[PDB]
Design a protein around this ligand. Structure first.
Ligand code: HEM
Ligand code: HEM
Ligand code: HEM
Ligand code: HEM
Lengths: 141, 146, 141, 146
């Protein structure tokens, strides 16, 4: 449901991020584990304390997967087919938690990219993050 | 939760004809067929391929006996749900790592079953009371989730 | 998305509804208004009392749109286009209430179809309803 | 709601440096923009078609000024959020007919506005303390819904 004005926005603000993606992703989780303790359940084999390398290493993957989606924003179902299967049959994360991350992500983009975080872009991204949550869970049943 | 004296009597009346052990295996099996992503905890249960395999698994059935048992014994302390489940709440978080959402999915598949089980007797006013009760039981299990 | 089987089961459970559709849709409404009072915020113009001509008439429309969705499940976006626009631009109902109306619709079908309502059919009806929820809210932004 | 010593000191210290008339105007505008269907309760507000409009609309900015105002008043009474909004809850339900869900959306848009305004200062622990206040205040408004 992303209008042209939407892809231009998403691409625009995700272009400014650039190298910082890893750092940014890493913070989105820390805000998630602290603001929504029930998402800590999916990581009982991690060390969730501030500065955890594991959390920074995971954020990196998550963020690269979004950069990958922003590139192939026209054909996501396929660029993300391998991730979709992984979350559907192996990780089995309840669909709800996808909303908590998206939210925690946008928050991390505002406290870092204030000039480009206009109410227009703000709405394009949320949709974007929604659109990725619709794919990553498409095959749960 | 806060049910009226008429709503509580209702709950108890209908639960006096519930075969706790059968409904247990029907509730826990249906939770794993409609929402397969719950199966993530029962790898050590064996065949969960087909709905029949899931519905005829002696382990799923046995676990259902437990769940709906601990559930049925909580109907006696409707006025103190948290107290009664304060320990299982702690356990599900720290050692089982079970996402609290599951108690909401199970609480709704429990309502659809009692509906399929009693028919016309499962009336709209009766359903609500049960909805308040399942929510209340879910809320209590997720009370000590740090 | 759906599977060839889910369709056969949907066309099954429904094919048995027949002429009890408008009446089953009426029960599903009373239930939703009782187990979830927050929904009555969208009907401040109705007489929400047992038997109401408004609540019954409505239950007839709702089901009929479902009977139409089932006939064209191989092509739902097209068939519910008129309602998509209606919900997105006029009524504007929060996408969360669609899930509540869905729960009350399964409770009804189960209390009325003892023989048919099997685990595998239950699973399919739940998907179908959510698939109907996705089309009606697809144009929200 | 319940907040620890460190949390409450984080929530307050920060709320002391907030122009309640700027954040409120902003917050209500974005709610209307990011989640359009919430534009339903405001027909008599004028032009809302473009975001540039919504944000420059005086009636929308005037409202947000009063809403976020009544919000600060409860920030003084955290230990009793339910009794502090007892009258407003009734109002929103009975005469306004506003689906409580809309308190959950505003609460999340309000944390984004705080993170956009303070930047780094809005550290993860701080935000955490804020997700609590909002959800709390949210239940408090939805508390007297029938
Ligand atoms: C924007 C949404 C999400 C994206 C794009 C994403 C992406 C990924 C990626 C790239 C991996 C690494 C796969 C590999 O090891 O090769 C992964 C793994 C994982 N994800 Fe997600 N994920 C998302 C949402 C979620 C959510 C909401 C949760 C949390 C409640 C979750 C839990 C996990 C877990 C537990 C793993 C495995 C961790 C490990 O490597 O040990 N993911 N995800
Ligand atoms: C109304 C809710 C429920 C009640 C009353 C409840 C109760 C119990 C009880 C009595 C135990 C045994 C604890 C012990 O080992 O000492 C337990 C264990 C467990 N429960 Fe729950 N439970 C509920 C819902 C669920 C659901 C929905 C799931 C997850 C999707 C779940 C998954 C488990 C698992 C994995 C164990 C351990 C399995 C085993 O060792 O046999 N429970 N629960
Ligand atoms: C499976 C989902 C739903 C379907 C298939 C559905 C279908 C319909 C239909 C067929 C109409 C009739 C429009 C006309 O008269 O031309 C309509 C109107 C309406 N719908 Fe939806 N709807 C659904 C969900 C919802 C939900 C969840 C709510 C809200 C809690 C809702 C609230 C309304 C209202 C307020 C009306 C207008 C009543 C009036 O005529 O004044 N709908 N819907
Ligand atoms: C943190 C939450 C909120 C607080 C503390 C709050 C507070 C208030 C207060 C103080 C009034 C003013 C009554 C008057 O003097 O006329 C009011 C009215 C109203 N609120 Fe809220 N409110 C909240 C959220 C919302 C939301 C999310 C909506 C809808 C999307 C909403 C819609 C309205 C409307 C339309 C009015 C009535 C305007 C009129 O007709 O005069 N409020 N609110």
């Amino acid at each position: 449901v992303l209008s042209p004005a939407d892809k231009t926005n998403v691409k625009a603000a995700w272009g400014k991020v650039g190298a910082h993606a890893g750092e940014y992703g890493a913070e989105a989780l820390e805000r998630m584990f602290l603001s929504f303790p029930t998402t800590k359940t999916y990581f009982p084999h991690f060390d969730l304390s501030h500065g955890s390398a594991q959390v920074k290493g995971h954020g990196k993957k998550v963020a690269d997967a979004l950069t990958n989606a922003v590139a192939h924003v026209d054909d996501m179902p396929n660029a993300l087919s391998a991730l979709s299967d992984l979350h559907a049959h192996k990780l089995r994360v309840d669909p709800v938690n996808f909303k908590l991350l998206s939210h925690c992500l946008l928050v991390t983009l505002a406290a870092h990219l204030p000039a480009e975080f206009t109410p227009a872009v703000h709405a394009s991204l949320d949709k974007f993050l929604a659109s990725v949550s619709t794919v990553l869970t498409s095959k749960y049943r | 939760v806060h049910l009226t004296p008429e709503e509580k009597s209702a709950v108890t009346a209908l639960w006096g004809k519930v075969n706790v052990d059968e409904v247990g295996g029907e509730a826990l099996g249906r939770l794993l067929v409609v929402y397969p992503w719950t199966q993530r905890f029962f790898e050590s249960f064996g065949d969960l391929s087909t709905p029949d395999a899931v519905m005829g698994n002696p382990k799923v059935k046995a676990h259902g006996k437990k769940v709906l048992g601990a559930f049925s014994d909580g109907l006696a302390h409707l006025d103190n749900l948290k107290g009664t489940f304060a320990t299982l709440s702690e356990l599900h978080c720290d050692k089982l790592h079970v996402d609290p959402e599951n108690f909401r999915l199970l609480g709704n598949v429990l309502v659809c079953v009692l509906a399929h089980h009693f028919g016309k007797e499962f009336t709209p006013p009766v359903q609500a009371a049960y909805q308040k009760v399942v929510a209340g039981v879910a809320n209590a299990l997720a009370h000590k989730y740090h």
